[PDB]
Design a protein around this ligand. Structure first.
Ligand SMILES: COc1cc2c(cc1OC)[C@@H]1CC(=O)[C@H](CC(C)C)CN1CC2
Length: 734
């Protein structure tokens, strides 16, 4: 960790100038924009002042967009290898030599300095031996750009770094143009710079235009990450810190709710919805740590003051005290839930479902700890006593959470609440979770009445079967959390099937007089256990799906979006808990439990079918799938098929790539937009044939007159703004 790391904790306004010559034609370009090193984001708007560019803009993307490598996000084992922020309070120099294949050369000198607030980059360019009928001077490069890798090794002799990479530009005729880049980077101002190990950076890029501008300009978007040296594999300090804290909080709150769980019941959810929405909307202004500790302090205060109601005289003071205890319990649980969910969403970015499943398992393992020590404290000390013993142990666990938790700081976002809530998929998520919470709230009060009226057992076995259903939920939560984490497209399927199995469970809850099924005990207990498993298999994949839809819509990453999605999760669980018991009790007094369970299960079933119909109707995502790999004797003939998913083939160009073992990727052939022009390598010239078919949205490559040289893995390449690849097929010849 260096001193210049602290400078890049925010947004940086950046300014770029270039002056260069190409065969006597001189140009000067100037640009402005922003950078963000927390996530690796660069956005520039770049305008010429001299006039027309005889050279294409993708030739200058590698000079201006790669000219600011200081906004690279490094993971926690790569902060030791940061060089760019090490010398940034004074500045560095970067010299680059670019060899275009079968054409001339660029040589650039650039200096990147930090003047005032702004970051300044000055570039001088020299261009040597360009043909007039070439891809560069003839304006033959497509107006999009590809994703790349940049490899950096160290250099002790100049205390700097040296990087090598290649850039594949697309030409309009179908082919590609290769540009090989060699750069050397050196500090100027004697700063303690970190000479790194061998590593590399991955660049995603995007290129567009501002439509209101009528000059010559480019809008450039850069995503950067860094890798190359593998992790130790075990956790960090902050992650074990937040796991111990969240586990202890979840244990304490669960056992507090288990040991002591109309106007006040509904106004409780009425304040709970508002508290969840307000805490979701304003979280960075309060902070995750402060709101964690505040929610735990108010929760412990509530469970201390719950014993005092026996010494409060009956009258207006009893109402004015129980009301305040009810609303403080509501806002304390809301604040603690949203704070814990947001901080664990930030702490584990890729493994978000596994942590939530593990905390659900610890909540179950803590609620099964209630009866023995609870009976010890009840028939050993008394009844006023166990609540204040619980309050003492929670208020002694609180300063640990004051000591341990890190200080995450962020800035307010660019969008609002109302843009997030207006998505269709999010509304269907909310409707599914309303069905689940309403089924749970209906299952609360009438089960004890049904057991007492039919089977003649008291509330002890009602609590026992509640324990069994919670245990099935606790077992089924982390496994399907791990399954939803590891496989992305199975997550939405587990969302649909969970609600469908839950609906089947609530229809088997009440034996329908049409269906002729008899009532007994172990069948009922088993259906409740399977209902717990279905609820667990549904509820865990909800939060990552809302996160994926939020990042897919275009919300900027940070803590604002995590806070909003956690607040919406708590809000939907609040409005479901509200809607559930009132409709369940109304249906129980009106028509009976037997049809009430059927109507509730049918509600859940139509919720799941609406979800499944939205998935069956409006799904589309860019994908390339391939087929045609086998083993053929030399001199044979083959056909390879690349089937696309979510773009028109007749409006975009297509490329075919190949790779040999122990060798880099090589371009084979390319097919343009209009379908009349094709491009080939001389090793596949006259032999390989490319074809398309826009009716079935598929492209094909046919081969004849085989050689042992063409044993390779073949790939299919598009660019629809981003670069998308395929999994490849193995083609072997003898
Ligand atoms: C009566 O309202 C409440 C109902 C419930 C809970 C808390 C309540 O408030 C005290 C807990 C909360 C979560 O930890 C768990 C449920 C999800 C919201 C993650 C476990 N459940 C049972 C339902």
């Amino acid at each position: 960790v260096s001193k210049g790391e602290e400078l890049f904790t925010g947004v940086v306004p950046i300014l770029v100038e270039l002056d260069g010559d190409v065969n006597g034609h001189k140009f000067s370009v100037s640009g402005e924009g922003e950078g963000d090193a927390t996530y690796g984001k660069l956005t520039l708007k770049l305008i010429c002042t001299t006039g027309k560019l005889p050279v294409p803009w993708p030739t200058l993307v590698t000079t201006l967009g790669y000219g600011l490598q200081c906004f690279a996000r490094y993971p926690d084992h790569m902060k030791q290898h940061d060089f760019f922020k090490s010398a940034m309070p004074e500045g560095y120099v970067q010299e680059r030599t670019i060899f275009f294949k079968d054409d001339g050369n660029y040589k650039t000198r650039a200096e990147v300095k930090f003047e005032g607030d702004t970051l300044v980059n000055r570039i001088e360019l020299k261009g040597i031996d360009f043909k007039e009928d070439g891809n560069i001077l003839g304006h033959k490069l497509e107006y999009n750009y590809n994703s790349h890798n940049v490899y950096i090794t160290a250099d002790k002799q100049k205390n700097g770094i040296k990087a090598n990479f290649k850039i594949r530009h697309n030409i309009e005729d179908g082919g590609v143009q290769l540009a090989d880049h060699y750069q050397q980077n050196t500090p100027i101002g004697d700063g303690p710079v970190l000479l790194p190990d061998n590593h590399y950076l991955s660049y995603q890029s995007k290129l567009s235009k501002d439509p209101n501008e009528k000059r010559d300009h480019m809008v450039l978007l850069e995503f950067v990450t860094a890798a190359g040296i593998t992790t130790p594999g075990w956790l960090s300090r902050e992650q074990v810190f937040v796991l111990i804290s969240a586990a202890s909080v979840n244990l304490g709150s669960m056992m507090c709710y288990s040991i002591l769980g109309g106007m006040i019941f509904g106004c409780f959810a009425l304040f709970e919805l508002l508290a969840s929405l307000v805490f979701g909307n304003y979280l960075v202004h309060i902070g995750a740590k402060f709101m964690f500790v505040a929610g735990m302090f108010v929760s412990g205060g509530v469970t201390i003051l719950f014993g005092v109601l026996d010494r409060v005289p009956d009258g207006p003071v009893f109402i004015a005290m129980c009301f305040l205890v009810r609303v403080m319990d509501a806002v304390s649980f809301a604040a603690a839930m949203t704070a814990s969910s947001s901080i664990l969403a930030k702490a584990f970015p890729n493994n978000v479902a596994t942590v939530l499943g593990s905390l659900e398992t610890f909540s179950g393992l803590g609620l099964i700890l209630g009866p023995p020590v609870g009976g010890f404290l009840y028939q050993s000390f008394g009844y006023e006593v166990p609540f204040i013993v619980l309050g003492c142990v929670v208020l002694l666990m609180v300063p640990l959470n004051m000591y341990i938790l890190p200080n995450y700081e962020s800035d307010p976002g660019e969008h609002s609440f109302w843009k997030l809530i207006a998505l269709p998929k999010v509304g269907l998520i909310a409707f599914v979770i309303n069905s689940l919470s309403s089924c749970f709230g209906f299952l609360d009060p009438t089960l004890s009445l049904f057991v007492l009226e039919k089977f003649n057992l008291p509330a002890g076995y009602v609590g026992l079967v509640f324990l069994g259903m919670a245990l099935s939920y606790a077992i089924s939560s982390p496994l399907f959390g791990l399954l939803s984490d590891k496989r992305p497209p199975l997550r939405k399927w587990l969302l649909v099937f969970g609600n469908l199995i839950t609906a089947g469970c609530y229809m088997l809850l009440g034996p329908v007089p049409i269906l002729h099924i008899k009532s007994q005990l172990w069948l009922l207990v088993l259906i409740l256990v399977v209902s717990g498993l279905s609820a667990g298999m549904s509820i865990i994949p909800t939060f990552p799906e809302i996160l994926s839809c939020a990042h897919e819509n275009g919300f900027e990453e940070g803590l604002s979006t995590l806070g909003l999605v956690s607040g919406l999760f708590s809000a939907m669980w609040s409005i479901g808990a509200f809607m559930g018991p009132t409709l369940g009790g109304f249906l129980y007094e009106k028509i009976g439990f037997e049809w009430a369970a059927a109507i509730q299960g049918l509600w859940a079933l139509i919720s799941g079918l609406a979800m499944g119909l939205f998935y069956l109707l409006e799904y589309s995502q860019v994908q390339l799938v391939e087929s045609g790999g086998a083993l053929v004797q030399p001199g044979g003939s083959l056909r390879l098929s690349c089937a696309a998913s979510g773009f028109p083939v007749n409006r975009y160009s297509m490329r075919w790539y190949r790779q040999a073992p122990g060798k880099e990727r090589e371009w084979v052939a390319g097919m343009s937009s209009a379908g009349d022009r094709s491009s080939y390598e001389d090793s596949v010239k006259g032999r390989f044939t490319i074809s398309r078919d826009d009716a079935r949205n598929t492209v094909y490559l046919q081969m004849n007159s085989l050689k042992p040289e063409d044993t390779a893995v073949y790939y299919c390449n598009v660019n629809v703004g981003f670069e998308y690849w395929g999994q490849g097929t193995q083609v072997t010849v003898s």
